[PDB]
Write an enzyme that holds these catalytic residues in place. Sequence first.
Site, PDB file in Angstrom:
ATOM      1  N   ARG A 151      57.175  44.994  30.456  1.00 57.75           N
ATOM      2  CA  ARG A 151      57.151  44.566  29.064  1.00 57.75           C
ATOM      3  C   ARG A 151      58.491  44.747  28.365  1.00 57.75           C
ATOM      4  O   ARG A 151      58.674  44.206  27.269  1.00 57.75           O
ATOM      5  CB  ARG A 151      56.062  45.322  28.302  1.00 57.75           C
ATOM      6  CG  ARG A 151      54.650  44.984  28.752  1.00 57.75           C
ATOM      7  CD  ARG A 151      53.615  45.802  28.001  1.00 57.75           C
ATOM      8  NE  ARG A 151      52.254  45.463  28.406  1.00 57.75           N
ATOM      9  CZ  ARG A 151      51.647  45.967  29.476  1.00 57.75           C
ATOM     10  NH1 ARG A 151      52.281  46.836  30.253  1.00 57.75           N
ATOM     11  NH2 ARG A 151      50.406  45.603  29.771  1.00 57.75           N
ATOM     12  N   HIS A 327      44.358  30.318  45.486  1.00 59.36           N
ATOM     13  CA  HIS A 327      43.516  30.713  44.368  1.00 59.36           C
ATOM     14  C   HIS A 327      42.249  29.863  44.350  1.00 59.36           C
ATOM     15  O   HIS A 327      42.339  28.637  44.187  1.00 59.36           O
ATOM     16  CB  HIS A 327      44.273  30.566  43.052  1.00 59.36           C
ATOM     17  CG  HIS A 327      43.527  31.093  41.865  1.00 59.36           C
ATOM     18  ND1 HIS A 327      42.548  30.371  41.219  1.00 59.36           N
ATOM     19  CD2 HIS A 327      43.616  32.276  41.212  1.00 59.36           C
ATOM     20  CE1 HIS A 327      42.067  31.084  40.215  1.00 59.36           C
ATOM     21  NE2 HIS A 327      42.698  32.244  40.189  1.00 59.36           N
ATOM     22  N   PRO A 328      41.069  30.457  44.514  1.00 61.84           N
ATOM     23  CA  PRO A 328      39.838  29.657  44.541  1.00 61.84           C
ATOM     24  C   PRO A 328      39.663  28.874  43.248  1.00 61.84           C
ATOM     25  O   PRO A 328      39.763  29.421  42.147  1.00 61.84           O
ATOM     26  CB  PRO A 328      38.740  30.710  44.721  1.00 61.84           C
ATOM     27  CG  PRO A 328      39.428  31.847  45.404  1.00 61.84           C
ATOM     28  CD  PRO A 328      40.810  31.877  44.815  1.00 61.84           C
ATOM     29  N   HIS A 356      30.185  31.188  44.503  1.00 53.20           N
ATOM     30  CA  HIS A 356      30.735  30.960  43.171  1.00 53.20           C
ATOM     31  C   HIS A 356      31.482  29.633  43.108  1.00 53.20           C
ATOM     32  O   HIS A 356      31.244  28.817  42.210  1.00 53.20           O
ATOM     33  CB  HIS A 356      31.653  32.116  42.776  1.00 53.20           C
ATOM     34  CG  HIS A 356      32.243  31.977  41.407  1.00 53.20           C
ATOM     35  ND1 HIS A 356      31.471  31.925  40.266  1.00 53.20           N
ATOM     36  CD2 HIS A 356      33.529  31.882  40.996  1.00 53.20           C
ATOM     37  CE1 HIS A 356      32.257  31.802  39.211  1.00 53.20           C
ATOM     38  NE2 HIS A 356      33.510  31.773  39.627  1.00 53.20           N
ATOM     39  N   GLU A 357      32.395  29.400  44.054  1.00 52.19           N
ATOM     40  CA  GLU A 357      33.125  28.137  44.076  1.00 52.19           C
ATOM     41  C   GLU A 357      32.177  26.957  44.234  1.00 52.19           C
ATOM     42  O   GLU A 357      32.389  25.895  43.638  1.00 52.19           O
ATOM     43  CB  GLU A 357      34.163  28.149  45.199  1.00 52.19           C
ATOM     44  CG  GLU A 357      35.261  29.183  45.016  1.00 52.19           C
ATOM     45  CD  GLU A 357      36.023  28.998  43.718  1.00 52.19           C
ATOM     46  OE1 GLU A 357      36.273  27.835  43.335  1.00 52.19           O
ATOM     47  OE2 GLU A 357      36.371  30.014  43.081  1.00 52.19           O
ATOM     48  N   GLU A 384      31.888  29.557  34.403  1.00 50.57           N
ATOM     49  CA  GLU A 384      31.873  30.622  35.395  1.00 50.57           C
ATOM     50  C   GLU A 384      30.586  31.436  35.378  1.00 50.57           C
ATOM     51  O   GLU A 384      30.348  32.211  36.310  1.00 50.57           O
ATOM     52  CB  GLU A 384      33.072  31.554  35.182  1.00 50.57           C
ATOM     53  CG  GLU A 384      33.203  32.657  36.220  1.00 50.57           C
ATOM     54  CD  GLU A 384      34.427  33.523  35.997  1.00 50.57           C
ATOM     55  OE1 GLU A 384      35.153  33.287  35.009  1.00 50.57           O
ATOM     56  OE2 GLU A 384      34.664  34.439  36.812  1.00 50.57           O
ATOM     57  N   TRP A 459      47.827  47.171  18.009  1.00 48.40           N
ATOM     58  CA  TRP A 459      47.374  46.923  19.375  1.00 48.40           C
ATOM     59  C   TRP A 459      46.863  48.202  20.025  1.00 48.40           C
ATOM     60  O   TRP A 459      45.727  48.253  20.510  1.00 48.40           O
ATOM     61  CB  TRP A 459      48.505  46.311  20.202  1.00 48.40           C
ATOM     62  CG  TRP A 459      48.133  46.067  21.633  1.00 48.40           C
ATOM     63  CD1 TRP A 459      48.512  46.807  22.714  1.00 48.40           C
ATOM     64  CD2 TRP A 459      47.304  45.014  22.136  1.00 48.40           C
ATOM     65  NE1 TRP A 459      47.971  46.278  23.862  1.00 48.40           N
ATOM     66  CE2 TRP A 459      47.225  45.176  23.534  1.00 48.40           C
ATOM     67  CE3 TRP A 459      46.621  43.949  21.543  1.00 48.40           C
ATOM     68  CZ2 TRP A 459      46.493  44.313  24.347  1.00 48.40           C
ATOM     69  CZ3 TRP A 459      45.894  43.093  22.351  1.00 48.40           C
ATOM     70  CH2 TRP A 459      45.835  43.281  23.736  1.00 48.40           C
ATOM     71  N   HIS A 487      46.414  34.487  30.657  1.00 51.21           N
ATOM     72  CA  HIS A 487      45.717  33.580  29.751  1.00 51.21           C
ATOM     73  C   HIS A 487      46.410  33.481  28.399  1.00 51.21           C
ATOM     74  O   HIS A 487      46.379  32.419  27.766  1.00 51.21           O
ATOM     75  CB  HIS A 487      44.268  34.031  29.574  1.00 51.21           C
ATOM     76  CG  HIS A 487      43.453  33.951  30.826  1.00 51.21           C
ATOM     77  ND1 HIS A 487      43.478  34.933  31.794  1.00 51.21           N
ATOM     78  CD2 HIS A 487      42.590  33.006  31.272  1.00 51.21           C
ATOM     79  CE1 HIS A 487      42.666  34.596  32.782  1.00 51.21           C
ATOM     80  NE2 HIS A 487      42.116  33.431  32.488  1.00 51.21           N
ATOM     81  N   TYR A 497      35.497  34.911  28.755  1.00 52.01           N
ATOM     82  CA  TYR A 497      35.141  35.946  29.719  1.00 52.01           C
ATOM     83  C   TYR A 497      34.159  36.957  29.141  1.00 52.01           C
ATOM     84  O   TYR A 497      33.368  37.542  29.890  1.00 52.01           O
ATOM     85  CB  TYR A 497      36.400  36.658  30.214  1.00 52.01           C
ATOM     86  CG  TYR A 497      37.335  35.766  30.999  1.00 52.01           C
ATOM     87  CD1 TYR A 497      37.178  35.598  32.368  1.00 52.01           C
ATOM     88  CD2 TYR A 497      38.371  35.088  30.371  1.00 52.01           C
ATOM     89  CE1 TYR A 497      38.028  34.782  33.090  1.00 52.01           C
ATOM     90  CE2 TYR A 497      39.225  34.270  31.085  1.00 52.01           C
ATOM     91  CZ  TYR A 497      39.048  34.121  32.444  1.00 52.01           C
ATOM     92  OH  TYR A 497      39.898  33.307  33.158  1.00 52.01           O
TER      93      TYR A 497
END
Lengths: 597, 194
Positions: A151, A327-328, A356-357, A384, A459, A487, A497
């Site tokens: 960071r 990456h799936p 899942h896929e 998802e 934060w 993201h 999510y």
Amino acid sequence: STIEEQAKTFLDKFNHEAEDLFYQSSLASWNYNTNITEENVQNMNNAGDKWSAFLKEQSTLAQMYPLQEIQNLTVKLQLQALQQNGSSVLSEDKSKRLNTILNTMSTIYSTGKVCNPDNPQECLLLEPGLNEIMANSLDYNERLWAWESWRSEVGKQLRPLYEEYVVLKNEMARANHYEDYGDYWRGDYEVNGVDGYDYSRGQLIEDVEHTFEEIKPLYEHLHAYVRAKLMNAYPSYISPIGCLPAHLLGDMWGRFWTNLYSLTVPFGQKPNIDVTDAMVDQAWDAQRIFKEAEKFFVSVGLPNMTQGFWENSMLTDPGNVQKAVCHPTAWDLGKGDFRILMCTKVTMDDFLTAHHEMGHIQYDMAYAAQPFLLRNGANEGFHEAVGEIMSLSAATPKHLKSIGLLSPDFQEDNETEINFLLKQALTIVGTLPFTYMLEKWRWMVFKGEIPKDQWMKKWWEMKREIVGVVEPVPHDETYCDPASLFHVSNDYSFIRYYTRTLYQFQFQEALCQAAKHEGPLHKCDISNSTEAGQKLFNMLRLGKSEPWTLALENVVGAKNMNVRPLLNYFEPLFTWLKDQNKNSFVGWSTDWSPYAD
Amino acid sequence: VFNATRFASVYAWNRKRISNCVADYSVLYNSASFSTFKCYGVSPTKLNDLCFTNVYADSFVIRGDEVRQIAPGQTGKIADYNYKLPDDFTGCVIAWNSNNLDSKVGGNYNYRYRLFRKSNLKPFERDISTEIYQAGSTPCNGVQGFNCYFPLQSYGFQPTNGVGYQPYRVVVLSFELLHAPATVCGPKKSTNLV
């Protein structure tokens, strides 16, 4: 004569012209991901720009059909997305400078790296380099060097680029008649036009905040247990009523605690369920891995996979000559063409990831009959969520013993399941606080409630209160924590999510009531049960054409999100953690800091 | 007829008049070269014993999901705006997957269809008019614009498309018995002589 006839006509011709350009745009990205070549890189830009400019050309004609004269609900929903001008509302400079900020922030993320303090010559990039090392690293200084130094050149350098991202995106929401940019993402849940099912955008802040209150007693016990096992390592920096270090969460951002499952195993004297050694002896490959999962969807009543699906699948990466992203991902192009690009090894996770896929592909088959603009999930959390309910059914010992992976004599008792719930709790209960924490912070910064200087002050101040994590090295307003996140830097929805956890559990409890399974929820298995599939198929084909509040009632019978299924599925684990935490203090305090004594 | 290299578009469908010959339908049914075969009003086994005066064989290409709209008293885009079957239609339907011929890499736009029409087509009616479709009262004058669209649309054809949308070549035989004498008849036998 009426505008309704003219609107339906514009919508009929739009699906055909948009289906051809959208299919070629997605097809170009497929050849680019499966094979890296100079021809595919250009085809993705040409096909991507042709489709991107298509909506911009159709948006001009979409604003000429007001929705006040349209009495059809399905018609307004199709024009609701086309009515938006996207970046056209922004100024010529603010519109072109926006793409430069997104491309600049996304480039620094992939090109960002932290050189080894002990080996200045060797410099490892974050992904995979920095993400893999932080996973298995047990060192306090080794984890702090890569966590603190990242960071410094990233969070600090991305602050000026993030400030423009906040001012630029706000101008787009204001031109759209939105309160702010934060409300822009909440529009996905917006529900209007149906009496009694209307869902306001501002109601999401109260639901996420009201449901999080019930998760505190479950997370507080899960946090106290994790701090007890790691308390022997550093008793000085780790207080009993304090918080755990931020860099010890098991990975860079502390999103998932699964990496800590090794040291957090309640019982080490008992075996664990793994299909890796079982699949090796069975001699299975990527070809039979998907075939075994296809039979699962047929047991619940869902149609099988088309011939082209299994023939066009990509089961591995043929060396560096032709390279693809492991990456799936579930790619839905159009015209009945479904494909999945993933690198298939032999592991217990790949088997669970296969369901899942395949869940995304199986989910796209139900609403495929809907119009182009009407093909989508009811919200950003159902994408998802439908795929997780399929994986949760495969992880149950009942499903594994059915196909023959697990030995039929394997003993299943509390000691065996208690260790399984903890593994799923870290990946589930661990992401919830981090999701509500980061998502809520973005809504406050974009809304203007947090001055630019208090970005970092608020934060960590809200971090110890939500997730109970303190910073080892204090930071000023220069650093930006979300700037480094995937993201946050890629301008993707981070709230999807959080709701995914509540939606996947609601369906798990409702689908098991249709199959008439008894006992704990984690023991439920939807295989061989054709009654649960018929109930879920109704909503699968609806997509976003109907309000998510209405479609959710036909499955779980609820008009909103509820935490009740979260307490029952985790109930057995909560009862055990409550006893193990009697000798310790349940909860944490926000007045403790590692550098403040 | 079905072996022809190229077939006309759904709007361009050609109508072939077959008369004055003998017809053997057992080879088409037992060849297993058709994806779907169905008849309306007449059984396949009875065609060999029946003589018909006029036999019209329709030819065209339509989407997979669009084949279900072909039947007496049907609806939909292709049925109303392209090709429709009267309620009394006595003929049969034949289709098979053309994805191995018509569909090619990059797409084939040669096969188009009429998306919009001011009304529904009449039984056994073919209109090739390309005149611009006027949705509202705004004048068009052949210039595309607001409330003005081009009715013909091209079918996307590529081998990677789903089986449901794969192009299917359909041959529609129209059996009509008029007052004129009958010619076309089923096959013969001609057994051994004693």
